[PDB]
Symmetry: C4
């Protein structure tokens, strides 16, 4: 699951995924990938 800090980072990640991998997109859009089924409180977007 990807978990972003802001709505900005969420749009960033989704657009990035058109051509990039999860892991690279998470980094550039300041998002976090988690193994859990829910996002932490601090990465709710």
């Amino acid at each position: 699951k990807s978990c972003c800090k802001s709505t900005l980072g969420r749009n960033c990640y989704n657009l990035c995924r058109a051509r990039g991998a999860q892991k690279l997109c998470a980094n550039v859009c300041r998002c976090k990938l988690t193994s859990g089924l829910s996002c932490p409180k601090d990465f709710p977007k």
Copy 2:
């Protein structure tokens, strides 16, 4: 597939998975992960 020993361990695993990986949750909730499509007799929950 995850296979737990008790109902307690099952609730434990399911809640744990909100933020943890299968493998760490199995350990802490005393469950077992199997490659089979069914659970052994001793981990039926």
Copy 3:
């Protein structure tokens, strides 16, 4: 995809998968695992 040589090997594999991994079950039931979407002529079951 699993591809078996006989119907016997097919029942064997399916039952085996209740508790075993694809790779171990293929071996014991004399089946083959393929990356292709179809089975070879010689493993049609």
Copy 4:
């Protein structure tokens, strides 16, 4: 996702996948595998 350069390469890849892996089929049919959800402009088929 697989992304091919021509329709020819697309038919090539799809037929190849009946018996081959993604990675080998991409190579022989001159296609590219991408982690992105969309294909680059130069591999649109």
